[PDB]
A paper describes a structure:
The obtained electron density map of the [name] structure, encompassing residues 28 to 652, presents an excellent quality all over the sequence. The two lobes enclose a deep cavity measuring ~16 Å in width and 45 Å in height, housing the peptide-binding pocket. Lobe 1 comprises Domain I (residues 29–63, 191–296, and 583–617) and Domain II (residues 64–190), while Lobe 2 consists solely Domain III (residues 297–582). The most striking feature of the [name] structure compared to OppA is the presence of an intriguing additional C-terminal 30-aa long α-helix (α19, spanning residues 622–652). This α-helix, which serves as distinctive hallmark of all the Ali proteins, establishes numerous hydrophobic and polar interactions with Domains I and II from Lobe 1, contributing significantly to the structural stability of the protein. The exposed surface of α19 is decorated with multiple basic residues, a conserved feature across all the OBPs in the Ami system that, besides its clear structural role, could help in proper orientation of the OBP on the membrane during oligopeptide binding. The ligand-bound and unbound forms of [name] retained the three-dimensional structures of the individual domains unaltered, as both conformations were related by a rigid-body rotation of ~20° of Lobe 1 (Domain III) relative to Lobe 2 (Domains I and III). [name] structure was solved by SAD technique.
Given the auxotrophic nature of pneumococci for certain amino acids, the Ami ABC transporter system, orchestrating oligopeptide uptake, becomes indispensable in host compartments lacking amino acids. The system comprises five exposed Oligopeptide Binding Proteins (OBPs) and four proteins building the ABC transporter channel. The five lipoproteins exhibit pairwise sequence identity of ~52–60% and share a very similar overall folding.
Numbering used by the authors: 29 to 652
Write the structure that this text describes.
Amino acid sequence: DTKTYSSTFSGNPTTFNYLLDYYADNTAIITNLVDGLLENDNHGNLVPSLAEDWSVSSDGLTYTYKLRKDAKWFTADGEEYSPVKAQDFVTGIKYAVDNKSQAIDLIQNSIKGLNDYITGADSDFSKVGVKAIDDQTVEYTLARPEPYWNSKTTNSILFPVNEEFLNSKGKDFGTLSPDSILYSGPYLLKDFTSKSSIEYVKNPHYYDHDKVSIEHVKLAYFDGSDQELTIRNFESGAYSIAGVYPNSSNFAKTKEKYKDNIVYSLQDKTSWYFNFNVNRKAYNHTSKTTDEQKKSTETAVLNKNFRQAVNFALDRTAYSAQSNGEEAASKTLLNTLVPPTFVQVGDKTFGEVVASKLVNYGTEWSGINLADAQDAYFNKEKAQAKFAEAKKELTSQGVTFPIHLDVAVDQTSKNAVTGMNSVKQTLESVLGSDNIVIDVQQLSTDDFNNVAFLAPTAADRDYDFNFDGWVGDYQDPSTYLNPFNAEDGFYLKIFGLDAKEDKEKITSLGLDTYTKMLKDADRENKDVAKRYEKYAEAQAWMIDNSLIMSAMSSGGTASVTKVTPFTRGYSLVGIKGDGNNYKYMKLQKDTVTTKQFEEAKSKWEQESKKAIEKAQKEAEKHVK
Ligand SMILES: [Mg+2]
């Protein structure tokens, strides 16, 4: 049945409130249920969704969108509720800001007048830069140019909501009940039963129903156990797709029976990295026992040669092999914060341009290759030479060796313990345990969140280094680089740093240089090739200074599938461009072969690079 997608869901959905929530387990559902202004085609271009047309002013400050006449709201049973109107986009922003949406930073500094609204005693919302010119016309006025603004509209904080429905539901809006939202997307939510089932049905009156091929989507809850049985459901025809997991027991027969069908998904939008804490104050989780050890570690992590030595000794493949497969460990490798083909810079990839700038920082970077799916960094001799320089500098400063580094893990993630033990093993093998000792702090999930992700302030980060990630949310290198800026970077805290109190240490680390590189790049909003080259300078600075050490992406997982490759909508950012968007997806009767996938990927790489060209000039025609 090529009209029924049957699979599983393994996360715990918590809310359908697409305006206030941006958690992946929730957006994977509501992207099928609610449309925004734009969506993505299968090549990554922004294309019409609820908006059939759009324009931008010459100064880049005013975006206007024309809603299509048959954009409609439906209740979950499929009955028409009301046409979508431009005021619904005003309602959405006011509601998202008044209730402090998880995604508010996407718009707070972007829409004109919004930051003042969130701080006036009675700041009137009619001063905010979102307006319904008439029923079919929504107009956004921005506080500064944002060449990436349209890509933001694929995030659900920018989706519309009908005010009368919103007001009538009140506290019952956007729960886990299908009737707690209205539907404007390709599907209706026919069922949601917590920890058992999600079912979508194609909306036959959706404006783009003729483009929707999958009529039924059935997802069964997968609780993480008994991995050996979803392949059996693939063979029987009960499932359209089946993951192939190293943590399983039937692997042998699976890999070999499906050796010519196992395909790997594209690397997705989460950039994982290791980072240092260079301003540690919290020592509730340490194997160090003396003030002198803590002083030695604090001085070491401030030494750039020391951080680079760790960087060159961190074997990313061995870490990836523990969580994923050792065969497929290389599929997820990532060497930059900004994925190396995230944008093109003229004839070159972003990663090629970053490499050209990075070589200027030192002979240790000569020949560096930052491409995906290989480890750019690991190099024993480079690590040992860097450490020897660091040890001379640090000994001269009064430090005692070996340097002990604490890293915390959630002990309930088996991939996390085995992964960090691999990092300990490799670092100590390469640099020597008379030089460095990695002390893994196994913690409960609650304690692990308290030392890092949920640490109340920068001063509460309780580790010397950590493994962490960033999800990009708009189509510009700054989405990955801005969080680490020294004026107001949201993620300065992961380094233990606060912009005001640690201004001196921030300057001494060179982060003012990084921050000025980002400002200079953001200034370029007419020539994107020049804009992106300037962001490459900042990415190269970050790599050289090794406060962040890029490691891997998400995605890149093995499966057998009946999904015809490269037909679904696709994007690097937003929620309309991942494997959870069934609208453009097509199913086939026969299992995809590795050979078919290779030919489809080459065809897609040709057509995508070309269509992105035709799409840009296309956007030059929308400048009004
Ligand atoms: Mg039900």
